[PDB]
């Protein structure tokens, strides 16, 4: 593809607002627009930043961060300012948190799978994200549109597929695992493996021994079936991202209201405990009602 060259002097750097696998992301201004820039911290991570630039120049999809351009001296990527911040911050951040619906949960997950499916279909060689997690999922358009960033490629163990820890030959299917865990997280509004805690190796041992997030009380069987297939030990038993897109696209018939912006506050006491099954944050009553009308 191609990249728009940008003069660094034309960029005005405001406060630092995030930190990826490498570099540091900041809020900024450029040419009568709000923008997010991503500068290098050191010369050691220059080669990583160039490969990211070469990949981002090729990608073009509604659910991947728009890259306006780049600077070469100093090295930095100029991106769209995601108004809504990260998904992580919307789910778990500082109060007041926003109210969201099952429809938002499923729409977010559909949009993520749409973006990952585009990367997995890239020719000649597929782009694997390798680090899919809510801190890398940004929200725009009042919290209704989701976008993937920091792709290609620590603190990620909770979303990372077992075969990746093991140093084993891995594939596209590592992102399907991550997506599975993200679906649980948006439905429950819970940090996965928060109760295990400790350092990263403790979650890695857990997940390697078969541990997965608890099942969700009253979760529709079609959604429970997709979720649990996504986090199989064997990556060949997980569905492709193309299959996830189709299934999730079809399910959205029963989840209307995904285009409503997040505007209501939420007072939070998500009921912990009850070992084994957990309660969802979102409500499925409307799902079951609409399903029944179509089926019986
Ligand atoms: N393009 C982007 N636009 C906006 C943000 C971002 C996150 N929080 N916030 C603000 C939003 C307003 C709130 O009052 C205070 C937090 C903006 C962010 C953030 Cl954070 C990242 C980010 C995080 C991790 C890795 C990575 N790679 N490329 S961009 C990126 O990109 C952003």
Listed by start position, the domains of the chain span 1-83, 84-296
- Neighbouring residues of 275: CB distance < 8 A, sequence distance ≥ 6: none
User: Which residue's alpha carbon is at the smallest distance from atom 28 of ligand 1?
Assistant: 150
Ligand 1 atom closest to the Cα of residue 86 is 7
CA angle (62, 65, 71) in 5-degree steps: 135
> What are the DSSP calls for the chain, one per residue?
----B--GGG-EEEEEEE--SSSEEEEEE-SSSEEEEEE-S-GGGHHHHHHHHHHHTT---TTB--EEEEEETTEEEEEE--TT-BHHHHHHSSSSEEP--HHHHHHHHHHHHHHHHHHHT-SSS----S---GGGEEEETTTTEEEE-S------GGGS-HHHHTT----THHHHHHHHHHHHHHHHT--TTTTT-SSHHHHHHHHHTT--PPPBTT--HHHHHHHHHHT-SSGGGSPPHHHHHHHHHHHGGG---TTS---SEE--------SS-B--SS--HHHHHHHHHH--
Residues designated catalytic = 131
Flag whether 21 is marked binding: yes
Flag whether 176 is marked binding: no
Q: What is the resolution of this structure in A?
A: 2.5
What CATH topology corresponds to 1-83?
Phosphorylase Kinase; domain 1 (3.30.200)
CA dist 166 and 202 (Å) reads: 14
Contact criterion met (CB below 8 Å) for 56 and 67: yes
Q: 1-83 and 84-296: same fold?
A: no
CA of 36 to the centre of ligand 1 (A): 7
- Match domain 84-296 to its CATH number in 1.10.510.10, 3.90.1170.50, 3.40.640.10, 1.10.3720.10: 1.10.510.10
């Amino acid at each position: 593809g191609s990249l728009h060259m940008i003069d660094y002097k034309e960029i005005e750097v405001e406060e630092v607002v995030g930190r990826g696998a490498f570099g540091v992301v900041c809020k900024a201004k450029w040419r009568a627009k709000d923008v997010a820039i991503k500068q290098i911290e050191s010369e050691s991570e220059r080669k990583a930043f160039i490969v990211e630039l070469r990949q981002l120049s090729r990608v073009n999809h509604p659910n991947i961060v728009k890259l306006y351009g780049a600077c070469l001296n100093p090295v930095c990527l100029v991106m769209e300012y995601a108004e809504g911040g990260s998904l992580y911050n919307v789910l778990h951040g500082a109060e007041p948190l926003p109210y969201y619906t099952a429809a938002h949960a499923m729409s977010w997950c559909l949009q993520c799978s749409q973006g990952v499916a585009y990367l997995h279909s890239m020719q000649p060689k597929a782009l694997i994200h390798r680090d899919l997690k809510p801190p890398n999922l940004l929200l725009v358009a009042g919290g209704t549109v989701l976008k993937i960033c920091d792709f290609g490629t620590k603190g990620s163990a909770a979303w990372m597929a077992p075969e990746v820890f093991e140093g084993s030959n891995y594939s596209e299917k590592c992102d399907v695992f991550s997506w599975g865990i993200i679906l649980w997280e948006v439905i429950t509004r819970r940090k996965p493996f928060d109760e295990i805690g400790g350092p990263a190796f403790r979650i890695m041992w857990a997940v390697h021994n078969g541990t997965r997030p608890p099942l969700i009380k009253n979760l529709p069987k079609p959604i429970e079936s997709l979720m649990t297939r996504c986090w199989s030990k064997d990556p060949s038993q997980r569905p492709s991202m193309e299959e996830i897109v189709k299934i999730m696209t079809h399910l959205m018939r029963y989840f209307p209201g995904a285009d409503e912006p997040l505007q209501y506050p939420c007072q939070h006491s998500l009921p912990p405990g009850e070992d084994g099954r957990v309660e969802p944050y979102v409500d499925f009553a409307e799902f079951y009602r609409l399903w029944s009308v179509d089926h019986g």
